[PDB]
Amino acid sequence: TTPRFWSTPLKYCRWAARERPALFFSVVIGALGPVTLATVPPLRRLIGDVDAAPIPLTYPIPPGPRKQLKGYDDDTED
């Protein structure tokens, strides 16, 4: 009565949807994530959606040598 998946994969998918919906649609929902992961980011960049830059979670220490500043020295107090 129940279809065999390898005998006929398209028939099995119809039976699983109708007769075992909670289990069948769990696999569809769970599989939709990897499909989202593989397809949305390319389309997002195609349409110009740009992933934002990370927010700083540590003081951003600049690179290169120090800038040899002259200002706000001790003699400027008073």
Partner 1 sequence: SQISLLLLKEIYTNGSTHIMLDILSVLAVISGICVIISKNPIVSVLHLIGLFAYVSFYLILIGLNFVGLSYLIVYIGAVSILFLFILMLINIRTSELQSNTSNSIPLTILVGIIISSFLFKMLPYGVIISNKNDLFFITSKIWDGALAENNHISSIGNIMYTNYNVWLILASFILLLAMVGAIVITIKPR
Partner 2 sequence: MATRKPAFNQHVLLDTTPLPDSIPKVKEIGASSAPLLSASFFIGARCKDYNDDYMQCKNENPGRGEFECLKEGRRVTRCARSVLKDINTHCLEQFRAHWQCLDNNNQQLWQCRPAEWKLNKCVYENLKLEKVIPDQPKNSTPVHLRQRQIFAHHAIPPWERPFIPGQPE
Partner 3 sequence: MSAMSIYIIFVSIIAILFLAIDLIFAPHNPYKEKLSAFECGFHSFSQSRSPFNISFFIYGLVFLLLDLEILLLYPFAVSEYVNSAYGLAAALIFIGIITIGFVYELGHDALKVH
Ligand X SMILES: CCCCCCCCCCCCCCCCCC(=O)OC[C@H](COP(=O)(O)OCCN)OC(=O)CCCCCCCCCCCCCCCCC
Ligand Y SMILES: CCCCCCCCCCCCCCCCCC(=O)OC[C@H](COP(=O)([O-])OCC(O)COP(=O)([O-])OC[C@@H](COC(=O)CCCCCCCCCCCCCCCCC)OC(=O)CCCCCCCCCCCCCCCCC)OC(=O)CCCCCCCCCCCCCCCCC
**Applying CB under 6 A, which residues contact ligand Y?**
34, 37-38
Site for partner 3 in 31-70 (CB under 8 A): 33, 54-55, 57
Coil, strand or helix: which one is 20? coil
DSSP assignment of 32-69: HHHHHHHHHHHHHHHTT--PPPPPPSS--PPPSS----
- The contact set with partner 3 (CB under 8 A) reads 23, 30, 33, 54-55, 57
Residues contributing to the site for partner 2 (CB under 8 A): 48-50, 52-53, 59, 61-62, 66-67, 69, 71-74, 76-77
